[PDB]
Design a protein around this nucleic acid. Structure first.
Lengths: 48, 136, 103, 182, 126, 48, 79
RNA sequence: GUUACGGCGGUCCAUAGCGGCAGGGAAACGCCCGGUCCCAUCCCGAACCCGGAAGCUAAGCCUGCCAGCGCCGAUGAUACUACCCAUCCGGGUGGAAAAGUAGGACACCGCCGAACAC
RNA sequence: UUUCUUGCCGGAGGUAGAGCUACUGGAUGGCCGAUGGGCCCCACAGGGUUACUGACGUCAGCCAAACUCCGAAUGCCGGU
RNA sequence: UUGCCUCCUAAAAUGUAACGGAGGCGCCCAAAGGUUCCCUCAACCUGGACGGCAAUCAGGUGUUGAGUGUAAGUGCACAA
């Protein structure tokens, strides 16, 4: 990384529907998000 | 008939009529062949005449290869003109034949008919030629 | 099976070159070069008549017993420079045939 | 102390999985994901450069890296495209950043696709990696439905050290990539 | 069993270093009066040879391998400084004062720059 | 479309050089550093 | 008729001006060429128009280095 | 002085290359773990650059063997050719290919410095 | 004597010749016959009798002043 | 048609004619100059979204096959 000319990068918390909060570095300024359909919630990924 | 689909240079020097052929000097396709014995520009006109002669003689059946291809253009300046004012435009296509070159080849069951057809082609041709065979 | 190695007299050439080869062909002797596993090539003058007879008898592929000054050496013709016009054998290449080797 | 979830899981158990499954003869043979390259060719750049501008912004948000403005290799008249015209947006992620980008992708974005039935393995693209092209950008949760401007779609190529298609498929399955392998 | 489909990064780096070195040598030669100070850089060590393309015979050489440079603690660039000093002494004793310094196809700066600066301060007019 | 332009030294105003630019590509008076022989040092040279 | 041809530039008198073995002063033009048919060798320089000239005196020597014909000047020791 | 050594170079730069079958990392060569720093990406520590030796000879590099692809390649002969003889045809002396054939070749040489020896 | 002749030696060349699967351009047959047309099952699903263009080309043998993987002989420059 | 450049004619040094065979030129450069340092280009897939012969930057593969500002050559991958 040269300088801050790239979008700011910081840790983020995603609270998915299943409750499995993931901690992942992302450029979301706020640092927190929620998703109604995650890996553990999707039919195909869960086993449908 | 036999005309190049394209020549890189339309106007070319007269092909040199020197030396015995280095390549195509043996029957390699058919049973019999017409081997040249003198230098000549075998025009596409002559090739067509000889090929039709052979095919019509051998009638139905047989196969005829035409090894040479009249790809060398020879120009002809317009009729009744004085020397100069640039080279004439291409007028007839020839194949530079040299002695020992096999011009035509024939595969036909009957040796009699094959030799007769090749002799007729030799008659249509503008030089001495002999009916050579593959069997050496 | 096998093919009898056709007998053919050969002489080592006292003079090799263009003039010598043309003189030989006039004399009726075809020049040939014997080479192969023998390491050292030898330059020979076969008899044109006899060699053409051998060739037209046993095809281009035939085994020749070359008598080189009275030395039976088995060879085969691997190349036959034939003049396209005169049709005469112009030159021969003779691959020494080791009695007990494949080619 | 600092390790992405996917990288930690890989180093811990996927190495053992691949070793045991494919009887690799060495750790260095044990494959391992390499750069994730996020491509997107706007295509209509000849008509509007603000399109490629928005594409650059979308990539910057999604991947987290300033995209490279990939020009056009040569001028093709049929596409109304001239050489040196900016035609695509590129992003290269490596190391922890690529690992966590894959984590985000796999655990949020793919399940957020509209009517998705698992990835396509038949087009797995073994030796290279796996280039699957998306139809829209809003599916990437990070960009807002209020901030989207136009359907974009992506091309993610997860280059791996997989020697061949079978080994790459095993690697990306163990990683998690939901394929529809039927 | 194994099929390294691509070209390994080690191979790529070796080839690229050789190419950069060749394009460098396209202008740097090194003559008996002004030898060429070739520098090879590794993740573990750094070596230097005063070579003479006329003879193709090296005049002097130093390397981080030597027990003295190994005893000199610090970092890679500290060892680079020490080897630059050593090659400067060896060259001066040989009778060579001026040289042309070959990067070896690497980049300026780092171990190689520290080595060149150390040799310069040691007394090589290169 | 590309006239013979004369670059003169800003300091002594000696017309020292005669080049050709493109009046279209570079309509502004050309500025490049070249030395007047009488000055000796490279000084800014401008179109006449 | 009228031919659209009839033009040709003045022959530039190119080629080798000093052949291998000729002793030359420091600066003589050894070769004139349009590309680098010959590449400059030891004590031989290449000019703007690809002229090979002698940077040092001595005898011309045509060699090859890495599949490229080259012109070299070998010094001539004064007897 | 000996090495399945590393570098720097040479060859009128493939007889050296490509491909295949097997082998090793001792010092080194490398891959390799990171980016705090010098430094860097028209994005990316991929590369370059910087610190270490956790791991590996799987790759690179190197060793031996394969003549498979490419590379070289005669000798003879021929084509061509300088000069000469020759009233068209040709021929002689000197030179002599290209292609093909026999075959060669899975490199050779010099400098340093490494580990061991001395 | 620098001139010229002859011998020897160092040279560069791309003519003659030859070759072209070494390039750029014009040519017999099988191979894939791929892109395709009818038949095709008439369905656009799927597949072959596929005398057909049968390509890039794959593999076997032939031409050029403005072709060259090559390449003389002479001539030319220089030295002795 | 007349001047200039390139090629072949031009007979392997240079040169060599024709109202001989082909073309270019009366420009573009403030970067397309200088310099330092980096990189290689064509051609096909394991494979891709609207993406097709062709875009991507798809290198994933592949050995210097394109590109030289512009005619032609001589060169240039070591790079020009």
């Amino acid at each position: 990384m040269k300088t801050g000319i790239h979008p700011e990068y910081v840790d983020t918390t995603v609270q998915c529907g299943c409750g499995h909060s993931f901690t992942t570095r992302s450029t979301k300024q706020s640092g927190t998000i929620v998703v109604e359909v995650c890996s553990q919630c999707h039919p195909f990924y869960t086993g449908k | 008939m036999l005309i190049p689909r394209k020549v890189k240079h339309r106007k070319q020097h007269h092909p040199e009529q020197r030396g015995i052929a280095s390549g195509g000097t043996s029957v390699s396709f058919g049973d019999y062949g017409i081997q040249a014995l003198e230098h000549a520009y075998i025009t596409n006109r002559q090739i067509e005449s000889a090929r039709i002669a052979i095919n019509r003689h051998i009638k139905r059946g047989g196969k005829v290869w035409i090894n040479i291809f009249p790809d060398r253009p020879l120009t002809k300046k317009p009729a009744e003109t004085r020397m100069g004012s640039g080279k004439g435009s291409p007028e007839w296509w020839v194949a530079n034949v040299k002695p020992g070159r096999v011009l035509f080849e024939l595969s036909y069951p009957d040796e009699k008919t094959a030799r007769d057809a090749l002799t007729r082609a030799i008659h249509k041709l503008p030089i001495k030629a002999r009916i050579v065979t593959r069997e050496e | 099976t096998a093919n009898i190695p056709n007998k053919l007299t050969a002489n080592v050439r006292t003079r090799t070159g263009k003039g010598a080869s043309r003189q030989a062909r006039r004399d009726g002797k075809v020049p040939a070069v014997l080479y192969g596993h023998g390491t050292d090539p030898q330059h020979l003058e076969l008899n044109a008549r006899d060699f053409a007879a051998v060739l037209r008898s046993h095809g281009t592929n035939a085994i020749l017993t070359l008598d080189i000054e009275g030395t039976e050496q088995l060879a085969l013709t691997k190349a036959l420079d034939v003049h396209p016009i005169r049709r005469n054998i112009q030159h021969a290449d003779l691959l020494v045939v080791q009695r007990g080797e494949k080619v | 102390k600092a390790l992405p979830r996917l990288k930690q899981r890989y180093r811990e158990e996927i190495r053992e999985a691949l070793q045991q499954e494919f009887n690799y003869a060495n750790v260095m043979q044990i494959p391992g994901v390499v750069k994730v390259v996020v491509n997107m060719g706007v295509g209509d750049a000849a008509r509007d450069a603000k399109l490629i501008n928005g594409a650059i912004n979308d990539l910057a948000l999604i991947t987290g890296q300033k995209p490279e403005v990939r020009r056009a290799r040569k001028s093709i008249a049929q596409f109304k495209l001239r050489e040196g015209m900016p035609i695509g947006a590129r992003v290269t992620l490596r190391g922890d950043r690529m690992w966590e980008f894959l984590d985000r992708l796999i655990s949020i974005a793919l399940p957020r696709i509209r009517d998705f039935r698992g990835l396509s393995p038949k087009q797995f693209d073994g030796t290279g990696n796996y280039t699957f092209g998306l139809n829209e950008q809003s599916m990437f949760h990070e960009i807002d439905v209020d901030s989207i401007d136009r359907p974009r779609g992506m091309d993610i190529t997860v280059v791996t050290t997989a020697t061949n298609d079978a080994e790459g498929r095993a690697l990306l399955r163990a990683l998690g990539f939901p394929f529809k392998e039927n | 069993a194994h099929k390294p489909v691509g070209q390994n990064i080690s191979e790529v780096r070796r080839n690229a270093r050789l190419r950069r070195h060749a394009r460098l040598r396209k202008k740097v030669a090194g003559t008996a009066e002004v030898p060429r100070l070739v520098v090879n850089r590794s993740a573990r060590h750094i070596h230097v040879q005063l070579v003479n393309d006329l003879n193709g015979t090296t005049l002097a050489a130093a390397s981080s391998i030597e027990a003295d440079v190994r005893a000199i603690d610090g970092d890679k660039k500290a060892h680079s400084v020490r080897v630059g000093q050593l090659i400067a002494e060896r060259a001066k004793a040989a009778g060579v004062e001026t040289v042309v310094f070959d990067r070896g196809g690497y980049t300026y700066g780092g171990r190689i720059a520290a080595l060149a600066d150390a040799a310069r301060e040691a007394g090589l007019k290169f | 479309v590309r006239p013979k332009i004369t670059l003169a030294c800003e300091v002594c105003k000696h017309r020292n050089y005669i080049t050709k630019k493109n009046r279209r590509n570079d309509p502004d008076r050309l500025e490049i550093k070249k030395f007047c022989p009488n000055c000796g040092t490279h000084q800014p040279h401008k179109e006449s | 008729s009228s031919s659209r041809n009839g033009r040709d530039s003045a022959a530039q008198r190119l080629g080798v001006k000093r052949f291998g073995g000729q002793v030359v002063k420091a600066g003589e033009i050894l070769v004139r060429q349009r590309g680098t048919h010959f590449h400059p060798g030891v004590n031989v320089g290449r000019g703007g128009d690809d002229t090979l000239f002698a940077l040092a005196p001595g005898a011309v020597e045509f060699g090859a280095k890495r599949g490229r014909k080259t012109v070299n000047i070998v010094p001539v020791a004064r007897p």
